[PDB]
Amino acid sequence: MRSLFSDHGKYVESFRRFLNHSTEHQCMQEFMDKKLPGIIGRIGDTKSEIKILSIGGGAGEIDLQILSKVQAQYPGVCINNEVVEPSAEQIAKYKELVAKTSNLENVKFAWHKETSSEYQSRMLEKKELQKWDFIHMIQMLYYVKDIPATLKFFHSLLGTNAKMLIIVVSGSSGWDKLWKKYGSRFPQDDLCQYITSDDLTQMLDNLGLKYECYDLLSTMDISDCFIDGNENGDLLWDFLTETXNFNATAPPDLRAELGKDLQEPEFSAKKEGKVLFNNTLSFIVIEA
Numbered sequence: 001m002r003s004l005f006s007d008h009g010k011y012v013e014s015f016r017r018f019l020n021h022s023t024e025h026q027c028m029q030e031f032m033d034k035k036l037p038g039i040i041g042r043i044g045d046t047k048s049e050i051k052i053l054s055i056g057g058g059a060g061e062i063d064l065q066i067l068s069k070v071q072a073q074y075p076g077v078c079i080n081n082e083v084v085e086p087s088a089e090q091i092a093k094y095k096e097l098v099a100k101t102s103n104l105e106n107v108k109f110a111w112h113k114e115t116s117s118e119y120q121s122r123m124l125e126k127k128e129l130q131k132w133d134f135i136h137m138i139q140m141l142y143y144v145k146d147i148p149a150t151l152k153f154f155h156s157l158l159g160t161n162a163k164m165l166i167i168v169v170s171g172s173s174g175w176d177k178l179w180k181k182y183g184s185r186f187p188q189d190d191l192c193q194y195i196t197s198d199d200l201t202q203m204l205d206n207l208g209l210k211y212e213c214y215d216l217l218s219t220m221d222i223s224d225c226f227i228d229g230n231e232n233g234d235l236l237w238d239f240l241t242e243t244x245n246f247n248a249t250a251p252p253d254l255r256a257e258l259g260k261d262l263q264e265p266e267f268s269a270k271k272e273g274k275v276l277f278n279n280t281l282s283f284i285v286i287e288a
């Protein structure tokens with residue numbers, strides 16, 4: 001088999017179906033509306049500029065919502081939103097989104113086509129480290145080589161009253177169960193780390209950083225995954241397994257097995273007929 005990250009083709013397409021078959025964005029949006037305002041309430045205090053660093057910003061749809069909340073707390077204040085993203089493709093999409101979005105006059109965007117790691121190296125050379133008021137790393141620590149070094153470095157970039165938000169799947173999610181029970185069944189992955197909020201809180205504890213973690217239930221409708229002849233299902237199987245052509249490249253044993261307990265209370269829930277895989281998310285807020 002081959003990590004999904006490989007075939008850029010389906011990698012991007014399996015994710016598309018994921019969002020259309022999950023509550024991932026609704027969950028995040030819920031967090032931005034109910035919890036974020038309170039979290040960023042003082043990051044702009046005494047500042048004539050608010051610096052926001054988006055690590056791993058994809059097309060920026062969540063980025064803009066966060067910006068929305070920031071502007072709401074600090075009307076009139078210029079916002080400098082820098083985005084660190086290696087994909088020239090995501091950057092292009094992010095830009096087009098920004099161009100079609102109204103009420104962004106007060107915001108200056110900057111895109112850095114590189115990984116958080118490269119960004120780190122480049123900054124460490126500079127005469128001095130620049131501070132940020134808000135840094136967010138949404139669903140991307142999975143693709144980082146050195147997580148503790150990333151957490152420690154970006155936390156060191158936090159200014160006075162600054163905050164750092166991290167989002168990854170929760171340790172109580174179905175992903176955690178899925179990775180513990182079938183982890184061995186798959187080959188080593190130099191392109192992806194299968195970590196959850198449990199791994200993060202452990203690293204944060206040892207790092208001695210102050211943080212708070214909130215969990216919000218989220219679901220992934222994996223119904224189509226149980227219909228042999230279904231294009232969408234097969235795509236969901238790739239995402240769910242972080243594997244290129246899973247059904248086609250995976251031992252019938254692993255396949256038949258997974259498709260069995262993927263319907264167990266252990267991994268999913270059955271409501272309205274649908275099979276809802278546990279996609280519970282964790283929102284981690286770190287203080288300067």
Ligand SMILES: CCN(CC)Cc1cc(Nc2ccnc3cc(Cl)ccc23)ccc1O
Nearest residue numbers: 011012015058090139142169175192194242
């Ligand atoms: C390695 C693990 N899986 C899930 C636990 C994590 C994971 C990755 C993502 N991000 C993505 C996965 C696959 N293709 C993608 C393609 C694009 Cl253009 C942007 C983000 C992607 C989103 C949610 C999520 O939970």
